[PDB]
Amino acid sequence: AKVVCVLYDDPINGYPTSYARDDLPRIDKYPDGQTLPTPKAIDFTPGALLGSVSGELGLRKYLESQGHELVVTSSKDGPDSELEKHLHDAEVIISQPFWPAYLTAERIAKAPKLKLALTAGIGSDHVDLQAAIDNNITVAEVTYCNSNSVAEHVVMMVLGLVRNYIPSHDWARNGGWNIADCVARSYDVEGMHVGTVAAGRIGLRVLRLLAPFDMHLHYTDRHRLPEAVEKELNLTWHATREDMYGACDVVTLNCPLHPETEHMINDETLKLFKRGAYLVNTARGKLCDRDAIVRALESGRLAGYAGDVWFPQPAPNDHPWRTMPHNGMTPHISGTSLSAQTRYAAGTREILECYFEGRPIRDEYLIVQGGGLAGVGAHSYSKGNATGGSEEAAKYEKL
Amino acid sequence: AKVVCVLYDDPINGYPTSYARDDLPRIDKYPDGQTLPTPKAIDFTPGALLGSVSGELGLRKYLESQGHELVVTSSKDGPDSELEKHLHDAEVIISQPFWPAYLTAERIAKAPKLKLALTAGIGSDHVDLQAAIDNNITVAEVTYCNSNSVAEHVVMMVLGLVRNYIPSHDWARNGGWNIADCVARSYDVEGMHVGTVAAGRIGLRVLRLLAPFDMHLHYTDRHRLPEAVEKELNLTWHATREDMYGACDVVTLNCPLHPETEHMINDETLKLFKRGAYLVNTARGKLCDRDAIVRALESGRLAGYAGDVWFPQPAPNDHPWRTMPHNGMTPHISGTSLSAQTRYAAGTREILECYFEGRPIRDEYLIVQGGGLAGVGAHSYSKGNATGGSEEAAKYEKL
Ligand SMILES: NC(=O)c1ccc[n+]([C@@H]2O[C@H](COP(=O)([O-])OP(=O)(O)OC[C@H]3O[C@@H](n4cnc5c(N)ncnc54)[C@H](O)[C@@H]3O)[C@@H](O)[C@H]2O)c1
Ligand SMILES: NC(=O)c1ccc[n+]([C@@H]2O[C@H](COP(=O)([O-])OP(=O)(O)OC[C@H]3O[C@@H](n4cnc5c(N)ncnc54)[C@H](O)[C@@H]3O)[C@@H](O)[C@H]2O)c1
């Protein structure tokens, strides 16, 4: 069969064979008891760069030795991409949320042999889920692979914004000292109220990381947590997201992207935040109206915004979040730290081995199967399409 | 009496009357049960900028109404400073570690009316403690005022270094995407070993903040913690600092500066770190040999270094830590967030009220009194002088 694997470019100065450290830490299992991926073998070295074109997710030997054709490319956006040329006979398409191959209805209709859309990471909203249901395609992703990695990045960005790290580093590297300039907007998080929209694998982990900072913890979710968990963390529950915003100094977004959540942060809902609130979004870029965020930072409704996720991806070179006031943005990186890459490469292989050998894919990895939501898809998503507007990624140019 | 108060400059665009938020969080007491400062009154608005020249620590009304003269200046370094002109008849000298008036032996000898050297913050190593003992001067500081503020900054910098935040933000603001360039040095902290040199008010708080990240926790201290605390956090104890370094992926320094600790990190002791270790130092700059740190980052012995403290302060414009590889420096700011400033301004007033009214200063605020170490000074310090080399601060120029 043909397998198309869309991956991001190698580093600008080439694909490295040496790294800052020699080993990854040992991790035995995930916090809810889920086991780490269980492929029969791996053909890579843990800790290596796996998610760029020359890393190939360590999949070449495995696939070729079975007689399959692996096509690896970074060319994904626009009507003349390499992806577009391989659609006609692709049986499996693999991509990562960090550099996503958008599988719109029109593209799925061009793909008559397509059976499996595989997300190397977590969040399958770059595939039109309504269309995958309609055309009987399986959508799978590597549940839990980087949920803890992302919760680290959330805490990092909450602290970065509130304490005013980025402009303070610039004063240091530019030869200055300038204490009052640094601290005119610098606070401690101690005693602040923080709320998360959703307490899933990431959102619950974020609450647990922030408890010892002596922040007052708030949440809302489609699924309420057990009473024992609420009581252990002294959680305040809010029945709707809109009830929660007014109560929080800091809000973090941790839900998936689907029609119930698309553009949930907008000009109208921002009016409900406290003046000078901080907003962190490592979930998906399209939860926020792009221009509403910029306006709120210009007026002081938000004291700061930070996240690693944008819409579309890659973001155009002049996307306004790059240069808006008081921002702590990164490109989409938290879920593709080197540590997470080894877990999701092993996971991608586990799913392919099941698929090719005719064994069932883990229920926790399933999003869509057999014309409906399935596995974690049924818990966390709703039916619909979130890919509208994704053609705009074609405008990005390297450098 | 004459009170000399050395404070840092106002912000470059002037002293503000508006802030990003309207209120500070309420804090009731410190974690070990110590009460917050108890001055009889305050003449400032909590949340305002207090530690610059125009903030005056909110002390003018109080002092003048008692018939005392308050001299406020930022001019402190060099033989022609304002500080130098006021030494001859100063009874009280106040300064903050962020912008410290170095009270060397020669300066103390010029100050025949001097009775009280007051540290607005924590860490009184910019005063020659041997000379204050010899000349019967009281040295006091505002214990606990910003210990929790600093422990937030430590976690922020540990995450920033390991996850590679700063260079990733630059790719975002410069129009790029460049995932592989960002994550070629990006790891999770999950499962790493972290050790602190000292577990005092800051160091113990840092261990408590990092426990839920599932890091393996290590420490050493002059004073060992109770067995119950070691057992609650699953702490690994090391009897010397040198035994601890080899066991750690990440090392954080949280001890005071005195002869036992001066230049403890140097070319010889860096050889004991794991290759690719991360070092964070928000304690004092002079714990580290300046050029040894630079060498270790050039060879890859250290994968990164970050901190807010330098020697001398302000650091010269070409101090090498500003531009060394893989650094996450800020100027000295963690202990002077707006939240901490209100606690230490109230504290500075509490001590002055005791002093002027002939009441005893809290034992927990004392460093030196009556020709010996006293209060927290006796617990945490040794006799000696750490001010050698501080004349070099005169080389700093604004901008
Ligand atoms: N690198 C990254 O920045 C990155 C990495 C992983 C995940 N993510 C994003 O984070 C999302 C969550 O990840 P996870 O591992 O926590 O997944 P999860 O499935 O365990 O958690 C999702 C949670 O959102 C809740 N939810 C669904 N719809 C909701 C709605 N209408 N309102 C409130 N809550 C709702 C679900 O009940 C669930 O608790 C992913 O779907 C992905 O989009 C981003
Ligand atoms: N803004 C800042 O970056 C900032 C703010 C506050 C404090 N600090 C620095 O941090 C230091 C500690 O602050 P704290 O509030 O934790 O003080 P603390 O007195 O409560 O803790 C100091 C700890 O260091 C230990 N110690 C003393 N000598 C030691 C040695 N030889 N080896 C190992 N441990 C030793 C003591 O036993 C004590 O546990 C201060 O003295 C100051 O220099 C910096």
Side-chain angles (χ1 to χ4, degrees), chain B residues 98 122-123 125 146-147 150 197-203 220-223 241 254-258 260-261 282-284 308-309 332 334-335 376 379-381:
Chain B
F98 329 106
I122 296 167
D125 51 273
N146 56 29
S147 308
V150 180
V197 173
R201 289 164 181 92
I202 301 176
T220 189
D221 197 292
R222 153 194 295 199
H223 300 296
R241 57 206 192 205
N254 296 297
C255 53
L257 176 64
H258 56 72
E260 298 182 343
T261 60
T282 59
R284 293 286 185 261
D308 65 332
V309 293
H332 187 184
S334 60
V376 176
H379 187 83
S380 290
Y381 285 82

mmCIF file of all heavy atoms in Angstrom, chain B residues 98 122-123 125 146-147 150 197-203 220-223 241 254-258 260-261 282-284 308-309 332 334-335 376 379-381, ligand 2:
data_model
loop_
_atom_site.group_PDB
_atom_site.id
_atom_site.type_symbol
_atom_site.label_atom_id
_atom_site.label_comp_id
_atom_site.label_asym_id
_atom_site.label_seq_id
_atom_site.Cartn_x
_atom_site.Cartn_y
_atom_site.Cartn_z
ATOM 1 N N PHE B 98 18.414 44.590 44.684
ATOM 2 C CA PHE B 98 18.289 44.817 43.227
ATOM 3 C C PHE B 98 19.138 45.975 42.766
ATOM 4 O O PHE B 98 19.539 46.023 41.596
ATOM 5 C CB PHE B 98 16.783 45.026 42.891
ATOM 6 C CG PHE B 98 15.923 44.255 43.825
ATOM 7 C CD1 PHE B 98 15.216 44.884 44.807
ATOM 8 C CD2 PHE B 98 15.915 42.859 43.775
ATOM 9 C CE1 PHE B 98 14.479 44.164 45.757
ATOM 10 C CE2 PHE B 98 15.171 42.107 44.732
ATOM 11 C CZ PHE B 98 14.476 42.765 45.731
ATOM 12 N N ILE B 122 15.771 40.654 50.937
ATOM 13 C CA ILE B 122 16.429 39.552 51.665
ATOM 14 C C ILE B 122 17.827 39.328 51.100
ATOM 15 O O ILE B 122 17.984 39.268 49.888
ATOM 16 C CB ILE B 122 15.603 38.230 51.484
ATOM 17 C CG1 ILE B 122 14.184 38.339 52.114
ATOM 18 C CG2 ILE B 122 16.382 36.976 52.014
ATOM 19 C CD1 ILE B 122 13.230 37.176 51.678
ATOM 20 N N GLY B 123 18.843 39.177 51.962
ATOM 21 C CA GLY B 123 20.248 38.952 51.536
ATOM 22 C C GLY B 123 21.059 40.222 51.823
ATOM 23 O O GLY B 123 20.925 41.224 51.122
ATOM 24 N N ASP B 125 24.428 40.553 52.043
ATOM 25 C CA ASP B 125 25.813 40.335 51.630
ATOM 26 C C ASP B 125 26.468 41.520 50.928
ATOM 27 O O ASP B 125 27.670 41.479 50.668
ATOM 28 C CB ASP B 125 25.836 39.127 50.675
ATOM 29 C CG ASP B 125 24.803 39.279 49.559
ATOM 30 O OD1 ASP B 125 23.621 38.886 49.748
ATOM 31 O OD2 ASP B 125 25.166 39.820 48.511
ATOM 32 N N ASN B 146 9.889 37.960 50.126
ATOM 33 C CA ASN B 146 9.793 37.624 48.706
ATOM 34 C C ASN B 146 10.301 36.214 48.437
ATOM 35 O O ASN B 146 10.594 35.872 47.271
ATOM 36 C CB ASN B 146 10.545 38.649 47.807
ATOM 37 C CG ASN B 146 12.005 38.791 48.198
ATOM 38 O OD1 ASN B 146 12.605 37.840 48.700
ATOM 39 N ND2 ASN B 146 12.583 39.970 47.978
ATOM 40 N N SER B 147 10.452 35.395 49.490
ATOM 41 C CA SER B 147 10.938 34.005 49.296
ATOM 42 C C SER B 147 10.017 33.223 48.348
ATOM 43 O O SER B 147 10.475 32.497 47.447
ATOM 44 C CB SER B 147 11.113 33.255 50.660
ATOM 45 O OG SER B 147 11.915 34.000 51.568
ATOM 46 N N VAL B 150 10.401 34.408 44.686
ATOM 47 C CA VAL B 150 11.605 33.881 44.027
ATOM 48 C C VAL B 150 11.428 32.409 43.603
ATOM 49 O O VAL B 150 11.905 31.995 42.551
ATOM 50 C CB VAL B 150 12.863 34.016 44.937
ATOM 51 C CG1 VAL B 150 14.102 33.466 44.237
ATOM 52 C CG2 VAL B 150 13.088 35.471 45.309
ATOM 53 N N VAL B 197 20.734 23.374 46.304
ATOM 54 C CA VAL B 197 21.682 23.672 47.372
ATOM 55 C C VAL B 197 20.959 24.638 48.300
ATOM 56 O O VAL B 197 20.695 25.808 47.943
ATOM 57 C CB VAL B 197 22.969 24.232 46.864
ATOM 58 C CG1 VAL B 197 23.836 24.694 48.070
ATOM 59 C CG2 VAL B 197 23.685 23.208 46.031
ATOM 60 N N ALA B 198 20.609 24.090 49.462
ATOM 61 C CA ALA B 198 19.816 24.674 50.557
ATOM 62 C C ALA B 198 18.319 24.445 50.421
ATOM 63 O O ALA B 198 17.737 24.583 49.338
ATOM 64 C CB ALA B 198 20.102 26.172 50.749
ATOM 65 N N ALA B 199 17.687 24.136 51.535
ATOM 66 C CA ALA B 199 16.249 24.055 51.601
ATOM 67 C C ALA B 199 15.716 24.985 52.676
ATOM 68 O O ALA B 199 15.054 24.530 53.627
ATOM 69 C CB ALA B 199 15.786 22.575 51.846
ATOM 70 N N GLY B 200 15.982 26.295 52.527
ATOM 71 C CA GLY B 200 15.442 27.279 53.454
ATOM 72 C C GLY B 200 14.061 27.722 52.959
ATOM 73 O O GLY B 200 13.309 26.939 52.331
ATOM 74 N N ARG B 201 13.699 28.977 53.235
ATOM 75 C CA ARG B 201 12.362 29.453 52.866
ATOM 76 C C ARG B 201 12.125 29.356 51.344
ATOM 77 O O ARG B 201 11.065 28.943 50.909
ATOM 78 C CB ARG B 201 12.179 30.896 53.383
ATOM 79 C CG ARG B 201 12.046 30.930 54.919
ATOM 80 C CD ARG B 201 12.265 32.386 55.484
ATOM 81 N NE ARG B 201 12.158 32.356 56.953
ATOM 82 C CZ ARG B 201 13.193 32.184 57.787
ATOM 83 N NH1 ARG B 201 14.435 32.082 57.311
ATOM 84 N NH2 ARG B 201 12.981 32.136 59.106
ATOM 85 N N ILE B 202 13.121 29.718 50.539
ATOM 86 C CA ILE B 202 13.013 29.562 49.085
ATOM 87 C C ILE B 202 13.205 28.100 48.655
ATOM 88 O O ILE B 202 12.393 27.575 47.897
ATOM 89 C CB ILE B 202 14.021 30.472 48.309
ATOM 90 C CG1 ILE B 202 13.777 31.968 48.655
ATOM 91 C CG2 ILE B 202 13.943 30.215 46.738
ATOM 92 C CD1 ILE B 202 14.801 33.021 48.010
ATOM 93 N N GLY B 203 14.294 27.469 49.102
ATOM 94 C CA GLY B 203 14.654 26.123 48.581
ATOM 95 C C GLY B 203 13.633 25.048 48.885
ATOM 96 O O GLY B 203 13.366 24.191 48.040
ATOM 97 N N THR B 220 20.635 19.357 49.671
ATOM 98 C CA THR B 220 21.590 19.422 50.762
ATOM 99 C C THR B 220 21.426 20.773 51.482
ATOM 100 O O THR B 220 20.874 21.722 50.883
ATOM 101 C CB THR B 220 23.042 19.143 50.313
ATOM 102 O OG1 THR B 220 23.854 19.016 51.499
ATOM 103 C CG2 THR B 220 23.565 20.281 49.409
ATOM 104 N N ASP B 221 21.799 20.834 52.771
ATOM 105 C CA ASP B 221 21.710 22.099 53.543
ATOM 106 C C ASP B 221 22.677 22.002 54.733
ATOM 107 O O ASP B 221 23.024 20.907 55.145
ATOM 108 C CB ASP B 221 20.265 22.340 54.021
ATOM 109 C CG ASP B 221 19.993 23.797 54.455
ATOM 110 O OD1 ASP B 221 20.534 24.251 55.488
ATOM 111 O OD2 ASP B 221 19.154 24.478 53.796
ATOM 112 N N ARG B 222 23.117 23.148 55.268
ATOM 113 C CA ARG B 222 23.834 23.168 56.548
ATOM 114 C C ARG B 222 22.945 22.534 57.635
ATOM 115 O O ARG B 222 23.407 21.765 58.471
ATOM 116 C CB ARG B 222 24.222 24.628 56.878
ATOM 117 C CG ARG B 222 24.378 24.957 58.365
ATOM 118 C CD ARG B 222 24.411 26.472 58.590
ATOM 119 N NE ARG B 222 25.564 27.124 57.993
ATOM 120 C CZ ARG B 222 25.989 28.341 58.356
ATOM 121 N NH1 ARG B 222 25.325 29.040 59.269
ATOM 122 N NH2 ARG B 222 27.079 28.859 57.804
ATOM 123 N N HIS B 223 21.647 22.824 57.570
ATOM 124 C CA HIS B 223 20.645 22.290 58.458
ATOM 125 C C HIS B 223 19.749 21.268 57.755
ATOM 126 O O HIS B 223 18.987 21.627 56.833
ATOM 127 C CB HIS B 223 19.759 23.436 58.969
ATOM 128 C CG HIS B 223 20.521 24.489 59.711
ATOM 129 N ND1 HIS B 223 21.168 24.232 60.899
ATOM 130 C CD2 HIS B 223 20.766 25.792 59.422
ATOM 131 C CE1 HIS B 223 21.776 25.330 61.314
ATOM 132 N NE2 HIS B 223 21.553 26.290 60.434
ATOM 133 N N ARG B 241 27.424 19.267 49.175
ATOM 134 C CA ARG B 241 26.955 19.749 47.879
ATOM 135 C C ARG B 241 27.627 19.009 46.735
ATOM 136 O O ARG B 241 26.998 18.714 45.706
ATOM 137 C CB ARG B 241 27.094 21.273 47.769
ATOM 138 C CG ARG B 241 28.461 21.785 47.972
ATOM 139 C CD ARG B 241 28.435 23.245 48.485
ATOM 140 N NE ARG B 241 29.786 23.824 48.418
ATOM 141 C CZ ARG B 241 30.197 24.832 49.192
ATOM 142 N NH1 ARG B 241 29.363 25.356 50.085
ATOM 143 N NH2 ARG B 241 31.427 25.317 49.071
ATOM 144 N N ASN B 254 20.116 27.964 46.139
ATOM 145 C CA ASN B 254 19.224 28.752 47.004
ATOM 146 C C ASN B 254 19.826 29.143 48.371
ATOM 147 O O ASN B 254 19.105 29.312 49.367
ATOM 148 C CB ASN B 254 17.873 28.036 47.148
ATOM 149 C CG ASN B 254 17.142 27.942 45.818
ATOM 150 O OD1 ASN B 254 16.798 28.973 45.244
ATOM 151 N ND2 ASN B 254 16.990 26.726 45.277
ATOM 152 N N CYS B 255 21.152 29.192 48.443
ATOM 153 C CA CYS B 255 21.833 29.521 49.728
ATOM 154 C C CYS B 255 22.271 31.003 49.739
ATOM 155 O O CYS B 255 22.344 31.607 48.675
ATOM 156 C CB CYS B 255 23.043 28.600 49.911
ATOM 157 S SG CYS B 255 24.155 28.606 48.512
ATOM 158 N N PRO B 256 22.593 31.565 50.924
ATOM 159 C CA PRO B 256 23.086 32.963 51.012
ATOM 160 C C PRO B 256 24.555 33.054 50.614
ATOM 161 O O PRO B 256 25.220 32.024 50.445
ATOM 162 C CB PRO B 256 22.901 33.340 52.483
ATOM 163 C CG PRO B 256 22.148 32.134 53.137
ATOM 164 C CD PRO B 256 22.451 30.947 52.263
ATOM 165 N N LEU B 257 25.022 34.281 50.393
ATOM 166 C CA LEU B 257 26.407 34.506 50.013
ATOM 167 C C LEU B 257 27.211 34.877 51.274
ATOM 168 O O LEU B 257 26.935 35.897 51.928
ATOM 169 C CB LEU B 257 26.525 35.661 48.996
ATOM 170 C CG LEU B 257 27.928 36.071 48.579
ATOM 171 C CD1 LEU B 257 28.707 34.938 47.824
ATOM 172 C CD2 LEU B 257 27.877 37.393 47.745
ATOM 173 N N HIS B 258 28.186 34.041 51.586
ATOM 174 C CA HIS B 258 29.145 34.279 52.664
ATOM 175 C C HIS B 258 30.379 33.374 52.380
ATOM 176 O O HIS B 258 30.390 32.658 51.373
ATOM 177 C CB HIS B 258 28.486 34.077 54.049
ATOM 178 C CG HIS B 258 27.867 32.732 54.227
ATOM 179 N ND1 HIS B 258 28.620 31.587 54.377
ATOM 180 C CD2 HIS B 258 26.568 32.344 54.273
ATOM 181 C CE1 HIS B 258 27.815 30.544 54.499
ATOM 182 N NE2 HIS B 258 26.565 30.977 54.437
ATOM 183 N N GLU B 260 31.724 30.583 53.089
ATOM 184 C CA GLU B 260 31.536 29.147 52.824
ATOM 185 C C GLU B 260 30.974 28.868 51.437
ATOM 186 O O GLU B 260 31.067 27.724 50.949
ATOM 187 C CB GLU B 260 30.547 28.531 53.826
ATOM 188 C CG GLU B 260 30.958 28.566 55.279
ATOM 189 C CD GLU B 260 29.924 27.887 56.208
ATOM 190 O OE1 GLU B 260 28.731 27.649 55.839
ATOM 191 O OE2 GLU B 260 30.333 27.580 57.350
ATOM 192 N N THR B 261 30.352 29.877 50.815
ATOM 193 C CA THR B 261 29.604 29.664 49.559
ATOM 194 C C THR B 261 30.108 30.466 48.375
ATOM 195 O O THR B 261 29.753 30.168 47.216
ATOM 196 C CB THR B 261 28.076 29.951 49.728
ATOM 197 O OG1 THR B 261 27.906 31.300 50.131
ATOM 198 C CG2 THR B 261 27.429 29.009 50.769
ATOM 199 N N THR B 282 19.076 31.928 41.286
ATOM 200 C CA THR B 282 18.443 33.147 41.756
ATOM 201 C C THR B 282 18.897 33.497 43.173
ATOM 202 O O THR B 282 18.252 34.314 43.835
ATOM 203 C CB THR B 282 16.895 32.996 41.801
ATOM 204 O OG1 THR B 282 16.578 31.921 42.676
ATOM 205 C CG2 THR B 282 16.308 32.691 40.397
ATOM 206 N N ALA B 283 20.004 32.936 43.669
ATOM 207 C CA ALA B 283 20.417 33.270 45.037
ATOM 208 C C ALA B 283 21.334 34.533 44.993
ATOM 209 O O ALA B 283 20.840 35.688 45.188
ATOM 210 C CB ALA B 283 21.077 32.039 45.783
ATOM 211 N N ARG B 284 22.622 34.333 44.699
ATOM 212 C CA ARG B 284 23.556 35.436 44.444
ATOM 213 C C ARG B 284 24.545 35.089 43.351
ATOM 214 O O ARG B 284 24.987 33.923 43.231
ATOM 215 C CB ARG B 284 24.308 35.884 45.742
ATOM 216 C CG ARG B 284 23.414 36.527 46.803
ATOM 217 C CD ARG B 284 23.007 37.960 46.371
ATOM 218 N NE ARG B 284 22.239 38.712 47.378
ATOM 219 C CZ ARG B 284 20.914 38.854 47.396
ATOM 220 N NH1 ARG B 284 20.144 38.250 46.468
ATOM 221 N NH2 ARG B 284 20.343 39.614 48.353
ATOM 222 N N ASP B 308 18.615 35.561 37.912
ATOM 223 C CA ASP B 308 18.365 36.992 37.910
ATOM 224 C C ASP B 308 19.453 37.768 38.669
ATOM 225 O O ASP B 308 19.408 38.995 38.686
ATOM 226 C CB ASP B 308 16.931 37.323 38.429
ATOM 227 C CG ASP B 308 16.708 36.945 39.895
ATOM 228 O OD1 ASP B 308 17.368 35.990 40.420
ATOM 229 O OD2 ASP B 308 15.863 37.631 40.525
ATOM 230 N N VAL B 309 20.477 37.080 39.190
ATOM 231 C CA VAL B 309 21.466 37.692 40.083
ATOM 232 C C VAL B 309 22.873 37.633 39.470
ATOM 233 O O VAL B 309 23.201 36.659 38.801
ATOM 234 C CB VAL B 309 21.445 37.073 41.497
ATOM 235 C CG1 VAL B 309 20.135 37.399 42.201
ATOM 236 C CG2 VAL B 309 21.669 35.546 41.416
ATOM 237 N N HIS B 332 18.139 41.714 37.994
ATOM 238 C CA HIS B 332 17.730 41.233 39.322
ATOM 239 C C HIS B 332 16.313 41.695 39.665
ATOM 240 O O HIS B 332 16.114 42.783 40.258
ATOM 241 C CB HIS B 332 18.755 41.667 40.369
ATOM 242 C CG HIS B 332 18.530 41.087 41.739
ATOM 243 N ND1 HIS B 332 19.305 41.440 42.832
ATOM 244 C CD2 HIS B 332 17.620 40.192 42.193
ATOM 245 C CE1 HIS B 332 18.884 40.772 43.895
ATOM 246 N NE2 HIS B 332 17.854 40.018 43.538
ATOM 247 N N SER B 334 13.314 39.121 40.536
ATOM 248 C CA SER B 334 12.272 38.191 41.053
ATOM 249 C C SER B 334 11.789 38.657 42.422
ATOM 250 O O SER B 334 10.612 38.557 42.720
ATOM 251 C CB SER B 334 12.762 36.741 41.168
ATOM 252 O OG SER B 334 13.858 36.698 42.037
ATOM 253 N N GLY B 335 12.692 39.182 43.237
ATOM 254 C CA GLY B 335 12.301 39.587 44.605
ATOM 255 C C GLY B 335 11.674 40.989 44.647
ATOM 256 O O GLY B 335 11.291 41.459 45.730
ATOM 257 N N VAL B 376 18.182 35.476 62.275
ATOM 258 C CA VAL B 376 18.380 34.568 61.117
ATOM 259 C C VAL B 376 19.832 34.567 60.648
ATOM 260 O O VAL B 376 20.299 33.566 60.057
ATOM 261 C CB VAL B 376 17.416 34.830 59.935
ATOM 262 C CG1 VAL B 376 17.749 33.921 58.760
ATOM 263 C CG2 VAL B 376 16.002 34.492 60.341
ATOM 264 N N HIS B 379 21.506 31.589 62.060
ATOM 265 C CA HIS B 379 21.070 30.335 61.395
ATOM 266 C C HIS B 379 21.729 30.142 60.006
ATOM 267 O O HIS B 379 22.165 29.038 59.629
ATOM 268 C CB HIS B 379 19.545 30.381 61.253
ATOM 269 C CG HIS B 379 18.923 29.112 60.755
ATOM 270 N ND1 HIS B 379 18.628 28.049 61.591
ATOM 271 C CD2 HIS B 379 18.480 28.757 59.518
ATOM 272 C CE1 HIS B 379 18.040 27.092 60.884
ATOM 273 N NE2 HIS B 379 17.937 27.498 59.628
ATOM 274 N N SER B 380 21.798 31.229 59.232
ATOM 275 C CA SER B 380 22.044 31.098 57.803
ATOM 276 C C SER B 380 23.380 31.582 57.289
ATOM 277 O O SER B 380 23.797 31.198 56.180
ATOM 278 C CB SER B 380 20.888 31.714 57.008
ATOM 279 O OG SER B 380 19.747 30.893 57.174
ATOM 280 N N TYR B 381 24.067 32.399 58.086
ATOM 281 C CA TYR B 381 25.325 32.998 57.637
ATOM 282 C C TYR B 381 26.558 32.551 58.429
ATOM 283 O O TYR B 381 26.421 31.968 59.504
ATOM 284 C CB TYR B 381 25.228 34.524 57.779
ATOM 285 C CG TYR B 381 24.376 35.157 56.708
ATOM 286 C CD1 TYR B 381 22.981 35.173 56.830
ATOM 287 C CD2 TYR B 381 24.970 35.733 55.575
ATOM 288 C CE1 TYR B 381 22.173 35.753 55.834
ATOM 289 C CE2 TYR B 381 24.194 36.337 54.607
ATOM 290 C CZ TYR B 381 22.802 36.339 54.736
ATOM 291 O OH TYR B 381 22.032 36.934 53.758
HETATM 292 N N1 LIG C 2 15.329 38.343 44.377
HETATM 293 C C1 LIG C 2 16.192 37.370 44.568
HETATM 294 O O1 LIG C 2 16.807 36.723 43.481
HETATM 295 C C2 LIG C 2 16.415 36.969 45.989
HETATM 296 C C3 LIG C 2 15.362 37.151 46.894
HETATM 297 C C4 LIG C 2 15.424 36.607 48.185
HETATM 298 C C5 LIG C 2 16.561 35.865 48.555
HETATM 299 N N2 LIG C 2 17.580 35.695 47.644
HETATM 300 C C6 LIG C 2 18.783 34.928 48.047
HETATM 301 O O2 LIG C 2 18.392 33.665 48.569
HETATM 302 C C7 LIG C 2 18.958 33.451 49.856
HETATM 303 C C8 LIG C 2 18.070 32.503 50.663
HETATM 304 O O3 LIG C 2 16.777 33.094 50.855
HETATM 305 P P1 LIG C 2 15.779 32.411 51.885
HETATM 306 O O4 LIG C 2 14.642 33.351 52.100
HETATM 307 O O5 LIG C 2 15.645 30.988 51.411
HETATM 308 O O6 LIG C 2 16.724 32.414 53.203
HETATM 309 P P2 LIG C 2 16.811 31.304 54.382
HETATM 310 O O7 LIG C 2 17.698 31.937 55.422
HETATM 311 O O8 LIG C 2 15.506 30.910 54.900
HETATM 312 O O9 LIG C 2 17.563 30.066 53.718
HETATM 313 C C9 LIG C 2 18.956 30.000 53.558
HETATM 314 C C10 LIG C 2 19.328 28.513 53.672
HETATM 315 O O10 LIG C 2 20.688 28.342 53.248
HETATM 316 C C11 LIG C 2 21.294 27.447 54.171
HETATM 317 N N3 LIG C 2 22.749 27.588 54.155
HETATM 318 C C12 LIG C 2 23.543 28.562 54.756
HETATM 319 N N4 LIG C 2 24.824 28.290 54.470
HETATM 320 C C13 LIG C 2 24.867 27.160 53.730
HETATM 321 C C14 LIG C 2 25.909 26.421 53.185
HETATM 322 N N5 LIG C 2 27.186 26.602 53.558
HETATM 323 N N6 LIG C 2 25.569 25.301 52.480
HETATM 324 C C15 LIG C 2 24.280 24.860 52.263
HETATM 325 N N7 LIG C 2 23.249 25.587 52.826
HETATM 326 C C16 LIG C 2 23.550 26.706 53.525
HETATM 327 C C17 LIG C 2 20.680 27.729 55.546
HETATM 328 O O11 LIG C 2 20.846 26.630 56.470
HETATM 329 C C18 LIG C 2 19.224 28.001 55.119
HETATM 330 O O12 LIG C 2 18.490 26.781 55.125
HETATM 331 C C19 LIG C 2 19.094 34.857 50.453
HETATM 332 O O13 LIG C 2 20.054 34.916 51.484
HETATM 333 C C20 LIG C 2 19.460 35.688 49.212
HETATM 334 O O14 LIG C 2 20.863 35.768 49.006
HETATM 335 C C21 LIG C 2 17.529 36.237 46.382
#
